[PDB]
Design an enzyme around this catalytic site. Structure first.
Site, PDB file in Angstrom:
ATOM      1  N   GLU A   1     -13.486   5.580  -1.385  1.00  0.00           N
ATOM      2  CA  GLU A   1     -14.448   4.795  -0.608  1.00  0.00           C
ATOM      3  C   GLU A   1     -15.241   5.733   0.315  1.00  0.00           C
ATOM      4  O   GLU A   1     -14.858   5.985   1.455  1.00  0.00           O
ATOM      5  CB  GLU A   1     -13.732   3.695   0.184  1.00  0.00           C
ATOM      6  CG  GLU A   1     -13.163   2.533  -0.666  1.00  0.00           C
ATOM      7  CD  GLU A   1     -12.291   1.594   0.165  1.00  0.00           C
ATOM      8  OE1 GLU A   1     -11.098   1.895   0.360  1.00  0.00           O
ATOM      9  OE2 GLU A   1     -12.780   0.570   0.657  1.00  0.00           O
TER      10      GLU A   1
ATOM     11  N   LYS B   1     -15.696   5.214   4.497  1.00  0.00           N
ATOM     12  CA  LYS B   1     -14.636   4.941   5.438  1.00  0.00           C
ATOM     13  C   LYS B   1     -14.737   5.885   6.633  1.00  0.00           C
ATOM     14  O   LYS B   1     -15.263   6.984   6.512  1.00  0.00           O
ATOM     15  CB  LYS B   1     -13.291   5.145   4.755  1.00  0.00           C
ATOM     16  CG  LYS B   1     -13.112   4.378   3.459  1.00  0.00           C
ATOM     17  CD  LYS B   1     -12.492   3.023   3.672  1.00  0.00           C
ATOM     18  CE  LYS B   1     -10.980   3.098   3.901  1.00  0.00           C
ATOM     19  NZ  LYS B   1     -10.422   1.750   4.236  1.00  0.00           N
TER      20      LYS B   1
ATOM     21  N   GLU C   1       0.836  -1.211   0.000  1.00  0.00           N
ATOM     22  CA  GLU C   1       0.000   0.000   0.000  1.00  0.00           C
ATOM     23  C   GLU C   1       0.848   1.228   0.000  1.00  0.00           C
ATOM     24  O   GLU C   1       1.802   1.316   0.764  1.00  0.00           O
ATOM     25  CB  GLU C   1      -0.861   0.113   1.236  1.00  0.00           C
ATOM     26  CG  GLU C   1      -2.242  -0.521   1.152  1.00  0.00           C
ATOM     27  CD  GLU C   1      -3.017  -0.369   2.455  1.00  0.00           C
ATOM     28  OE1 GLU C   1      -2.719   0.559   3.231  1.00  0.00           O
ATOM     29  OE2 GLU C   1      -3.928  -1.168   2.712  1.00  0.00           O
TER      30      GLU C   1
ATOM     31  N   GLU D   1      -9.337   9.523   4.211  1.00  0.00           N
ATOM     32  CA  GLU D   1      -9.636   8.119   3.923  1.00  0.00           C
ATOM     33  C   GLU D   1     -10.614   7.934   2.774  1.00  0.00           C
ATOM     34  O   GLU D   1     -10.535   6.940   2.046  1.00  0.00           O
ATOM     35  CB  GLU D   1     -10.217   7.434   5.142  1.00  0.00           C
ATOM     36  CG  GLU D   1      -9.347   7.432   6.356  1.00  0.00           C
ATOM     37  CD  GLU D   1      -7.978   6.882   6.079  1.00  0.00           C
ATOM     38  OE1 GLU D   1      -7.880   5.796   5.464  1.00  0.00           O
ATOM     39  OE2 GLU D   1      -6.985   7.567   6.450  1.00  0.00           O
TER      40      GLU D   1
END
Length: 306
Positions: free
Chosen positions: A279, A282, A231, A288
């Protein structure tokens, strides 16, 4: 290069739509955070290499017994391999607490089950975050702060499995804007740090970080263990330094860099960019919800040539 595929939003595309987007863009790697059946099926003969996380909620179940790990392999791996090119299995992602006590026995248990299933090509590892590594400066001063990580490095060493690391220069930079320059952070000319211990030179925060993991591995007694950057990414909104220009600059920069390795190891470094889409569900910091290369509707968040 690869892209991590998160599905924590209420407006993302169908799995098969997703796989198609990947093949179109020429992305050859995917990381998924749990045994997603729809992703796996869609992945058959797609030619995309995959990192398959077991899911933290599965850690205790798998750590208990080899029959538990065999049942998981039978349902979640055996039906898709070899059509789906599962390269690694992450037995846990950034696990914390007494749960860390489960990572080595789950790792063993999966190695035993894959073995008996005749699936020994698939390698078993665990995904960690950089905060696992102390005295990261100079990078040569890196050492694993937790005891259990030595146990893991040794198992990886003997099994020929690599270590998957979640490396984000963004978080380092964000926390320390005074000591760290945006250039150094985003792969731009300007800064040079010299590791006194071995005399290597550093021009990017990314290299300095990865090499700290290598420092720690060596001290753990695991010198030949490789690192897969499981990541790395930069947010386009929601906080400090989050912007498309910064996110475009970091990621493209990243893509154009990894093929040369780092000062400690000049081999190409396997890396997964976090993540494919934003997303919208999150929790945690506002950033995030903004790590995506693409918008939920399949439109480019910013331009990136893969």
């Amino acid at each position: 290069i690869g892209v991590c595929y998160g599905v924590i939003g209420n407006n993302l595309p169908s799995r098969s739509d997703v796989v198609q987007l990947y093949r179109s863009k020429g992305i050859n790697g995917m990381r998924i955070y749990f045994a997603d059946g729809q992703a796996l099926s869609a992945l058959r003969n797609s030619g995309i290499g995959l990192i398959l996380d077991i899911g933290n909620d599965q850690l205790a179940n798998i750590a208990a017994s080899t029959s538990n790990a065999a049942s998981w392999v039978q349902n979640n791996v055996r039906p898709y391999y070899p059509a789906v090119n599962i390269k690694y299995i992450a037995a846990g992602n950034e696990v914390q607490g007494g749960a860390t006590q489960s990572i080595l026995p789950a790792m063993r248990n999966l190695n035993a089950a894959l073995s008996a299933a005749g699936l020994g090509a698939i390698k078993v590892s665990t995904s960690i975050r950089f905060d696992e590594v102390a005295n990261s400066f100079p990078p040569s001063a890196g050492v694993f702060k937790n005891a259990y990580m030595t146990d893991v490095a040794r198992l990886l060493a003997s099994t020929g499995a690599p270590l998957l690391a979640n490396v984000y220069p963004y978080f380092a930079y964000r926390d320390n804007p005074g000591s760290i320059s945006l250039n150094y952070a985003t792969f731009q000319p300007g800064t040079t740090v010299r590791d006194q211990n071995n005399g290597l030179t550093y021009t990017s925060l990314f290299d300095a970080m990865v090499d700290a993991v290598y420092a720690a591995l060596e001290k753990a007694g695991a010198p030949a263990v490789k690192v897969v950057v499981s990541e790395s990414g930069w947010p386009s909104a929601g906080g400090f330094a989050a912007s498309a220009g910064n996110a475009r600059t970091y990621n493209q920069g990243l893509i154009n860099h990894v093929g040369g390795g780092t000062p400690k190891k000049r081999e190409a470094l396997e890396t997964y960019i976090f993540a494919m889409f934003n997303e919208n569900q999150k929790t945690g910091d506002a950033t995030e919800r903004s790590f995506g290369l693409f918008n939920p509707d399949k439109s480019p968040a910013y331009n990136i040539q893969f």
